Write an enzyme that holds these catalytic residues in place. Sequence first.
Site, PDB file in Angstrom:
ATOM      1  N   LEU A 128      -5.251   9.809   0.132  1.00  0.00           N
ATOM      2  CA  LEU A 128      -5.566   9.478   1.536  1.00  0.00           C
ATOM      3  C   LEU A 128      -7.067   9.151   1.837  1.00  0.00           C
ATOM      4  O   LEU A 128      -7.322   8.438   2.812  1.00  0.00           O
ATOM      5  CB  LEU A 128      -5.003  10.624   2.404  1.00  0.00           C
ATOM      6  CG  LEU A 128      -3.454  10.565   2.583  1.00  0.00           C
ATOM      7  CD1 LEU A 128      -2.586  11.201   1.471  1.00  0.00           C
ATOM      8  CD2 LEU A 128      -3.098  11.182   3.922  1.00  0.00           C
ATOM      9  N   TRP A 142       4.190  15.710  -0.334  1.00  0.00           N
ATOM     10  CA  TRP A 142       3.068  16.315  -1.034  1.00  0.00           C
ATOM     11  C   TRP A 142       1.931  16.231   0.024  1.00  0.00           C
ATOM     12  O   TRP A 142       1.843  15.452   0.977  1.00  0.00           O
ATOM     13  CB  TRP A 142       2.733  15.730  -2.398  1.00  0.00           C
ATOM     14  CG  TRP A 142       2.366  14.238  -2.141  1.00  0.00           C
ATOM     15  CD1 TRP A 142       1.355  13.453  -1.603  1.00  0.00           C
ATOM     16  CD2 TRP A 142       3.483  13.267  -2.464  1.00  0.00           C
ATOM     17  NE1 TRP A 142       1.729  12.167  -1.515  1.00  0.00           N
ATOM     18  CE2 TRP A 142       2.969  11.953  -2.071  1.00  0.00           C
ATOM     19  CE3 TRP A 142       4.781  13.336  -3.154  1.00  0.00           C
ATOM     20  CZ2 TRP A 142       3.691  10.758  -2.117  1.00  0.00           C
ATOM     21  CZ3 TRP A 142       5.439  12.094  -3.318  1.00  0.00           C
ATOM     22  CH2 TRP A 142       4.896  10.882  -2.839  1.00  0.00           C
ATOM     23  N   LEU A 144       5.122  13.115   4.337  1.00  0.00           N
ATOM     24  CA  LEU A 144       4.850  12.970   2.965  1.00  0.00           C
ATOM     25  C   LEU A 144       5.438  14.305   2.412  1.00  0.00           C
ATOM     26  O   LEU A 144       5.654  15.329   2.746  1.00  0.00           O
ATOM     27  CB  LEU A 144       3.303  12.943   2.748  1.00  0.00           C
ATOM     28  CG  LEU A 144       2.515  11.662   3.167  1.00  0.00           C
ATOM     29  CD1 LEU A 144       1.020  11.986   3.359  1.00  0.00           C
ATOM     30  CD2 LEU A 144       2.630  10.548   2.105  1.00  0.00           C
ATOM     31  N   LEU A 160      -5.300   5.642  13.515  1.00  0.00           N
ATOM     32  CA  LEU A 160      -6.408   5.809  12.529  1.00  0.00           C
ATOM     33  C   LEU A 160      -7.379   4.608  12.614  1.00  0.00           C
ATOM     34  O   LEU A 160      -6.958   3.452  12.674  1.00  0.00           O
ATOM     35  CB  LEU A 160      -6.060   6.065  11.027  1.00  0.00           C
ATOM     36  CG  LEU A 160      -4.995   5.261  10.234  1.00  0.00           C
ATOM     37  CD1 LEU A 160      -4.852   5.859   8.816  1.00  0.00           C
ATOM     38  CD2 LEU A 160      -3.611   5.235  10.895  1.00  0.00           C
ATOM     39  N   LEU A 200       0.924  -1.204   0.000  1.00  0.00           N
ATOM     40  CA  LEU A 200       0.000   0.000   0.000  1.00  0.00           C
ATOM     41  C   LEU A 200       0.947   1.234   0.000  1.00  0.00           C
ATOM     42  O   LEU A 200       1.511   1.565   1.050  1.00  0.00           O
ATOM     43  CB  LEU A 200      -0.950   0.004   1.303  1.00  0.00           C
ATOM     44  CG  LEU A 200      -1.625   1.261   2.035  1.00  0.00           C
ATOM     45  CD1 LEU A 200      -2.626   1.955   1.093  1.00  0.00           C
ATOM     46  CD2 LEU A 200      -2.294   1.094   3.489  1.00  0.00           C
TER      47      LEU A 200
HETATM   48  C1  LIG Z   1       2.110  10.430   7.426  1.00  0.00           C
HETATM   49  O1  LIG Z   1       1.333  10.976   6.363  1.00  0.00           O
HETATM   50  C2  LIG Z   1       0.421  10.059   5.902  1.00  0.00           C
HETATM   51  C3  LIG Z   1       0.824   9.071   5.013  1.00  0.00           C
HETATM   52  C4  LIG Z   1      -0.076   8.146   4.539  1.00  0.00           C
HETATM   53  C5  LIG Z   1       0.657   7.212   3.599  1.00  0.00           C
HETATM   54  C6  LIG Z   1       0.078   7.029   2.198  1.00  0.00           C
HETATM   55  C7  LIG Z   1      -0.855   7.957   1.679  1.00  0.00           C
HETATM   56  N1  LIG Z   1      -1.550   7.680   0.573  1.00  0.00           N
HETATM   57  C8  LIG Z   1      -1.317   6.517  -0.017  1.00  0.00           C
HETATM   58  N2  LIG Z   1      -2.145   6.129  -0.968  1.00  0.00           N
HETATM   59  N3  LIG Z   1      -0.367   5.658   0.287  1.00  0.00           N
HETATM   60  C9  LIG Z   1       0.356   5.899   1.370  1.00  0.00           C
HETATM   61  N4  LIG Z   1       1.386   5.097   1.597  1.00  0.00           N
HETATM   62  C10 LIG Z   1      -1.401   8.157   5.013  1.00  0.00           C
HETATM   63  C11 LIG Z   1      -1.795   9.132   5.952  1.00  0.00           C
HETATM   64  O2  LIG Z   1      -3.006   9.242   6.611  1.00  0.00           O
HETATM   65  C12 LIG Z   1      -4.196   8.564   6.203  1.00  0.00           C
HETATM   66  C13 LIG Z   1      -5.377   9.185   6.960  1.00  0.00           C
HETATM   67  C14 LIG Z   1      -6.730   9.015   6.247  1.00  0.00           C
HETATM   68  C15 LIG Z   1      -7.934   8.842   7.198  1.00  0.00           C
HETATM   69  C16 LIG Z   1      -9.146   9.267   6.342  1.00  0.00           C
HETATM   70  C17 LIG Z   1      -8.898  10.643   5.665  1.00  0.00           C
HETATM   71  C18 LIG Z   1      -9.937  11.149   4.647  1.00  0.00           C
HETATM   72  O3  LIG Z   1     -10.632  10.326   4.008  1.00  0.00           O
HETATM   73  O4  LIG Z   1     -10.035  12.377   4.435  1.00  0.00           O
HETATM   74  C19 LIG Z   1      -8.055   7.407   7.793  1.00  0.00           C
HETATM   75  O5  LIG Z   1      -8.609   7.238   8.898  1.00  0.00           O
HETATM   76  O6  LIG Z   1      -7.689   6.450   7.092  1.00  0.00           O
HETATM   77  C20 LIG Z   1      -0.894  10.116   6.337  1.00  0.00           C
HETATM   78 BR1  LIG Z   1      -1.430  11.556   7.508  1.00  0.00          BR
END
Ligand SMILES: COc1cc(Cc2c[nH+]c(N)nc2N)cc(OCCC[C@@H](CCC(=O)[O-])C(=O)[O-])c1Br
Length: 162
Positions: free
Chosen positions: A27, A21, A19, A54, A4
């Site tokens: 996300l 970006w 990140l 999360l 992922l």
């Molecule tokens: C450290 O920075 C990050 C890196 C990621 C890593 C990442 C991002 N995006 C993708 N596709 N691959 C990854 N490896 C995710 C993340 O938070 C995911 C949080 C999403 C929320 C929902 C958010 C929403 O839908 O607006 C959750 O509970 O899953 C953060 Br903050």
Amino acid sequence: TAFLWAQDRDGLIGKDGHLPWHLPDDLHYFRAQTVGKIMVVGRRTYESFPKRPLPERTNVVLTHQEDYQAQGAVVVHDVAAVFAYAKQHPDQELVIAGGAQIFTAFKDDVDTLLVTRLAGSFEGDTKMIPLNWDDFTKVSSRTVEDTNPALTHTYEVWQKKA
Ligand SMILES: COc1cc(Cc2c[nH+]c(N)nc2N)cc(OCCC[C@@H](CCC(=O)[O-])C(=O)[O-])c1Br
């Protein structure tokens, strides 16, 4: 077992523990490509999530610190514990969400790649681990255009050949 991730055009995945970006679409697909599964992340990627844990997925945090505390997460110390947890689990798919040191620890047991490819190039310090692309097929590709064209991205699903 899936990996992922999201990378720029050169493979970059991280910058200064965060990140390189900010790409809300990707996300939204982090939250639901792992709503329900066993989600494995390295200690430093877990500490850099805003909410810790999360919710709605099993967060397993991989750490060498014997004492580490993470309420509500499954805290283990080697890869054998991850799979011993996954064996108990059964019905939940295992998704490795990073970062680089954890991708290297599961580099032999991944069967599917869930990659988001950014069209642009970003500055940072952590790249995705090298993988044999030639051993996988791209099954699915969906492209999303963004008004910052560096941010335009493609979601690919790749599955490991027989
Ligand atoms: C450290 O920075 C990050 C890196 C990621 C890593 C990442 C991002 N995006 C993708 N596709 N691959 C990854 N490896 C995710 C993340 O938070 C995911 C949080 C999403 C929320 C929902 C958010 C929403 O839908 O607006 C959750 O509970 O899953 C953060 Br903050």
